[PDB]
Symmetry: C3
Subunit: 193 residues, 3 copies
């Protein structure tokens, strides 16, 4: 069971979201439809609230937390890369937070923006829409190209389809002990076509 | 069960500490009273010993490890931020290790010091007491203000109370499938008063 | 059970590898003999394939992932440090990827090379054999010394022995509630001799 209450406060999870059985949701976490929450994601709403809006994804070993009475918000189609940490911040619609990046309290990321991997967005920093920001600490570098925004959108659509594939077919299994010529492989994923 | 033995060596956990059921304690880990160990914290004492002293906290997806026959020590009121990695080091009393930072072997952090997020403290580095150090690799920047030390203390007191709240009331639950007007929320946490 | 299928694709795990019960293997992951997979390692082969070759190790809260139809490869004696993230890349034989580092898509790391902790290897970067590379973003700094390569080899041999120790003796246990003079400790690990 990935969900835990604290002080009687129970997570809310849309039946149309996928939460991997190894993630942890604590306290006042609200997950909307279409969301993918990956392995070892910790959505810990024991000091404040966390709200993950529709069609967003939270990837592996990501952490979402905040200070007392904070609200940590990931808006629609937010795309939180592996190992990123979101603390008391607002992630705008269709933002990409790069792998292993840290977004600190009261920061806000404007819509469609991309945060590079390994970045740190300082507390209270307001990053505008449609830009690339990177570094540790990060700063705004330039506007995104149209190609970059389409690439980002496609990547989030893959995670929207991933949530459905996982709700449809992910199950615990005993591993095989060797390969074989007849086993299903990554070539049998729909992405192969 | 978060505890695992190796070579017959069994973790020691104070009944007055909280270890989240999804953390992992392996081998010669000793946890003292008042400690909070969060989700997916890996306290892996399969090469050496780990000792976490009273009223300290280890946050989500943190890792504590060391080389063979090492001793990795977090002293009283040590505050290990989300995703930090402690390797074969000594964390002094009431230190704050910022989110996603790495502290390498034989490093020592003096009491009350704050390590910024996303930092790397090099092997064998000796950081004095009562300073701010940050960067990757990190260096000492300046002394802490009195206000900064009081802020840090308050944050660790929140985790001391968190361990008690979790021992008192954290339990596995089925999530709710939608919000409602009568559900308990983060506004019902004591921090609201 | 650490293994999950997706679209009917089942992980392959050598009976001579150790996968910690808290890791997660999804989809087309193939693990060869002698490998150690640590706590909260996420080997997520739901977009492409992951292949971990013999005597390699993947450490705590590491993530291995890739884009659709990618192949993410860790060659023999690859040594993936705590919290590192491997995305769609090729890790050469006997490479060390430092803690909390990110290796991006299509990058290749030549044999015996060492990537410093907290590094970022950019997409499509080709790092040669037998060097040290570090930084975020990283660059090649210098060749490794002979001493450095022997030190690295010894560290991977410790993980080769660790997999056997874990297959031999790691088990879930109730923790002890206090220390005692007769308990087994890290001094009873073979490394003590
Ligand atoms: Ca990290
Ligand atoms: Zn926090
Ligand atoms: Zn280690
Ligand atoms: Zn990925």
């Amino acid at each position: 069971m990935p969900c835990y209450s604290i002080d009687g406060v129970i997570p809310v999870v849309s039946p149309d979201a996928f939460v991997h059985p190894t993630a942890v949701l604590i306290g006042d976490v609200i997950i909307e439809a279409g969301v993918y929450v990956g392995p070892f994601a910790s959505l810990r709403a024991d000091f404040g609230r966390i709200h993950i809006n529709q069609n967003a994804n939270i990837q592996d070993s990501c952490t979402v937390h905040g200070f007392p009475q904070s609200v940590t918000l990931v808006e629609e189609m937010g795309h939180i890369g592996h190992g990123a940490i979101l603390h008391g911040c607002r992630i705008g619609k269709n933002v990409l937070v790069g792998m292993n990046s840290v977004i600190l309290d009261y920061a806000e990321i404007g819509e469609n923006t991309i945060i590079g991997a390994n970045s740190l967005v300082k507390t209270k920093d307001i990053i505008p829409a449609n830009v690339l920001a990177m570094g540790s600490p990060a700063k705004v570098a330039r506007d995104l190209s149209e190609q970059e925004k389409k690439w980002k959108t496609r990547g989030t659509q893959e995670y929207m389809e991933l949530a459905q594939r996982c709700l449809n077919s992910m199950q615990e299994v005993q591993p095989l002990s060797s390969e074989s010529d007849d086993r299903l492989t990554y070539k049998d994923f729909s992405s192969s076509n």
